[PDB]
Design a binder for this molecule. Structure first.
Ligand SMILES: *C[C@@H](O)[C@@H](O)[C@@H](O)COP(=O)(O)O
Ligand SMILES: *C[C@@H](O)[C@@H](O)[C@@H](O)COP(=O)(O)O
Ligand SMILES: *C[C@@H](O)[C@@H](O)[C@@H](O)COP(=O)(O)O
Ligand SMILES: *C[C@H](O)[C@@H](O)[C@@H](O)COP(=O)(O)O
Ligand SMILES: *C[C@H](O)[C@@H](O)[C@@H](O)COP(=O)(O)O
Lengths: 274, 274, 278, 278, 278
């Protein structure tokens, strides 16, 4: 039912961070992250490599879980219901069926209704978000452009979803059906979304967040929170970058604080344009 | 709710006939039609004309209704909710939001949930049928190729819907979501359709039915009934054509009867290939 | 500003009304007898102008003289797009309103009339919000849809109604920072975009126009939130012009009443045949 | 198997024969008087169906009744491709054979009739070996060429004859391992391909059909190894139908005899004008 | 028929099993120690063959001799597509099964091996139902998916599994009359299509093959209804081949048990890096 949602609700105002190990995960707990996202590799280092990126060894997760007390999350390949089965069995707080890993099924996503473990999925537009939720995702995030340290695609996606909801809310009761068709989304979720003027699940920004300014910007555009990986551990000073981002996120409307935690941060991740 | 469906159920095994007047409508009652479909013009005569085809003068309907006792049905232009409002007010047994009339709205169909009067809509494939029902249609029909007297498009549509339901029923629980997207149909009706191995409403053949053999063929392919217009009143002998088609439809698996009522029928409508 | 407010004051009184195209006195009295709030005087009705390749210009002023003294409702006329001199003449003839219309043959392909230089209010057509706002920016006091004039087919008018109406609602939802690129996209003047946003509607009276053949068509345009209707071809190319005219007016006045709408469609006669082009 | 063998037994008796299209009793007796082994009953002959855009369906059964009691030779009829119900009716009327024909307007664009569900034997058309074998796979008991029906032009029938006949000889030459990819290429059922290979011919009677206008045309089809001929338009649109009909039959019976072939072409009259399309 | 039934009897015993590619004795014992039901003997594993432009042929028979006397499980080998002579040699060497494989360099681009001429059973690859049925029609006793061999990426195998599995279910739903055009569309032999339809599955054992890098991948293929798995590159290019091999087998034997599946993935080591091509 919706204890899944209930669980996700506690994430509002939070930062989840990608970690490949214990020190990284400890740094994250010390920063005030509400959760870590455990990966073999963090997206920036997965970008010049043509290997098959799979969900992480479950031993790696246990090692890390016992050394921190915040929520523990992991990635699964799109469509790989067995990697999910294994991790659900292991008990994780949340699964991210993620495009950063190598797709396991080119046409079907995981039937997320078959799990007690809640799922987060990626999205770049309203129809896609609503399709992920129809399959049972409990939470959404933008895809951005993982590991590039460039906020632009994240911003595009945040606004695309927002503007489509606005167009949706501008439509009269009869116009919503043809819209549903165009979006290729289920009418029932389209109508609920219209009812709320937002997505019916929690909705985080993700991909390319490199500075506290980026994190706060996503928040000011109405996101419920943020995922950050590359931006922390590719930066000059990861603990301090991690800490500032969480502060930015907790105080996104406070320029005094945004200034303060932005001072003296060191070099952000170089990132990659193109 | 579903007294709408309930009403439609009584149509199973029936023939509805297009009439532009009283004699034609009387001929239809005498043939054993369960209903007439009242039009300014019948589709064959609407095909070499470039006029705007609208729903019929409501006086014409009253004139005809009082002179017969079978069900009375009329056409409305696609998207013309006011022509519907007027006819719902007049009390008709059923509305056909029909492609044979001149579309009034190029993007939106009538919000059929706003009416007590039940609606029939056209279709050529499963997704389209399910979109019409999502908008509140209580009954579906194929579009065929109205007024051409050629059964081929009707047959295509009957089988397209059937084969898509079969593909739908061949899919596992996770595969149904991507299918829904491809069909651009609402998941909830897709799942109900899958649950039944047929459309969730009554489903008639329509367009191009010219002989008892055609009518029975549609029936043998699993339709619940038939609409015929041009095939009757463009034929050499309309009363006898009307009578035979109803017999064919009531006895579609009976070759002895199909033969009998096909004998001596006169020339069917010339029709139009191309 | 005061001349703009003055013209807007005037146009408000058209709200809820029907304006009928006419060629002659005979037709204008049919219109007044029907309850039209005004007539729009034409050399030819749009259904006739589709059937010729002639140049279509504003009416001889004599015909506005002749008609106007036989009726007491508002008198309007069409001028060709960009033809500021045709307007100067009718401004001098004193007429209640001008329609710079795409139904006549354009006179200037790049410039509409600078409508600010006239005390007579203008109505212009639009198919979307930016176009409307551009027309209003040039001084139009009123807007109508274009639809497909003279075809008796409602489909384009309905598209145009919905497009503007959705664009207006969407614009109102945008954050104030997003309104600049949207203005660019619509190629509309920001300040008229900010005004629509503050009003939550078009800043002028806005009528449905094009292809209205029945009371159902008129009432539909009203149910989609229009303030009124223009009807040309659908009256005088129908079987019974008088009764078609009167029932359109009742439909516009009573657009949310099925009973009346039914009542006035009964035995109405054959509507304009129309043209659903080949 | 036994029903298949039973139908094949029946079709053999057509070998060496001519089957003539007819519309009426008058024509059917001309056919019987000519020595045709059967008539094929039609609402319209193919030359007439090229000159209309009408939907072309199987004949009223009454007309099969009327004709059949005036003649003693075989009675056949056409059903539309995929129209299994038209077939059910004629199966019930009892007729000697059905032709699921491309000359009538297709009823189903993806599926032919499941011919196995009928005791009446079917003939179908083909333009190549795979098509034939597919038709036989669906239960056809007999095959004919399509040619160009009703044009009076022999050129397509000859292509179709040669294509199948060469494909059959080539198939027989292939090594057994090569027969699988060839089956794929022809999109034919392997087992009917292995059967043709073991028989060194089509597994069914195979007639020439389409555009046969003279005894020379019929005899040519026979010299290319066909078992028989269908002729529609070439008889009753010729100058002297009776004499054209009788001389075709003699030509088919005597297809390797120049003297007779000469003899029956003499003073035959003007053959169908035909249509060598623009 | 009896030789076919005899071969099918044999292939059944592979059900539930894992077959592992090997190059040498050392690897084959790792496979036997892991519980593989057989090894597939190769000059090079597929991950190595992607990294060269060499011609890839069946293994030197000496290497089948050497390996076979050091293990007691089934011994299989690859022959090049269409290379019936390579098969004749291995048939003469007596090996438990042959794989006519697309991983080796094709020997004939138009013809696969006529597998009926061998007592040794063959396995072939497929990416859809028609292909499978064609392979079985040529005498394959067993089928596997192709997937993307040597890439360690499961995505193509999963597509291939689903396609065949859906096509099989759909075929079973079709009415008997629709089965002919579907056979044409798949370019498959009708009689093997009718057989799949009567069995409601492929008429042969059917394994998953290509890109299986983890126990999760193997178990997924089994949950999608496959009867078994082949694994090449994913074992011996992983960190700990022995433990990866044993845990794959347990996953295949216990594919519906999360607890075990978890248990055998724990601390497994780094799986083959793989290649998600540029
Ligand atoms: C300008 C005026 O004639 C409008 O009515 C025009 O756009 C549509 O008129 P009609 O009713 O003749 O289509
Ligand atoms: C079906 C039958 O009419 C055949 O003869 C046809 O394919 C050719 O007939 P025609 O001799 O009229 O060309
Ligand atoms: C032929 C055999 O090597 C199959 O495994 C091949 O198609 C896939 O192997 P891999 O596991 O190396 O991808
Ligand atoms: C998938 C992961 O949770 C998410 O962080 C990525 O999409 C973006 O991470 P960055 O490395 O871009 O911060
Ligand atoms: C719309 C109407 O109900 C339906 O009859 C048409 O689509 C087909 O009628 P025919 O004239 O083809 O019989």
């Amino acid at each position: 039912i919706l204890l899944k949602h209930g669980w996700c609700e506690m994430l509002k105002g939070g930062v989840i961070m990608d970690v490949k190990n214990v020190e990284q995960a400890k740094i994250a707990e010390k920063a005030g992250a509400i959760g870590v996202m455990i990966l073999e590799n963090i997206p920036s280092e997965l970008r010049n490599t043509d290997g098959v990126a799979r969900s992480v060894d479950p031993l790696k997760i246990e090692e890390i879980r016992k050394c921190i007390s915040i929520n523990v999350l992991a990635k699964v390949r799109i469509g790989h219901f067995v990697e999910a089965q294994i991790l659900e069995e292991l008990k994780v707080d949340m699964l991210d069926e993620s495009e950063v890993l190598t797709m396991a099924d080119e046409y079907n996503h995981i039937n997320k209704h078959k799990f007690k473990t809640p799922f987060v999925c990626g999205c770049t537009n309203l129809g896609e978000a609503l399709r992920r939720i129809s399959e049972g995702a409990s939470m959404i995030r933008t895809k951005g452009e993982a590991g590039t340290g460039n906020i632009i695609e994240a911003i595009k996606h945040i606004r695309t979803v927002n503007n489509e909801i606005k167009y949706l809310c501008s439509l009269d009761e009869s116009e919503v059906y043809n819209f549903a068709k165009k979006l290729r989304a289920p009418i029932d979720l389209i109508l609920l979304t219209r009812k709320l003027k937002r997505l019916p699940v929690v909705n985080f920004a993700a991909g390319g967040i490199a500075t506290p300014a980026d994190a706060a910007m996503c928040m000011q555009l109405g996101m419920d929170g943020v995922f950050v990986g590359s931006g922390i551990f590719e930066s000059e000073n990861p603990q301090k970058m991690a800490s500032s981002i969480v502060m930015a996120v907790s105080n996104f409307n406070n320029p005094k604080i945004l200034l303060n935690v932005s001072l003296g941060l060191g070099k952000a991740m170089h990132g990659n344009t193109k």
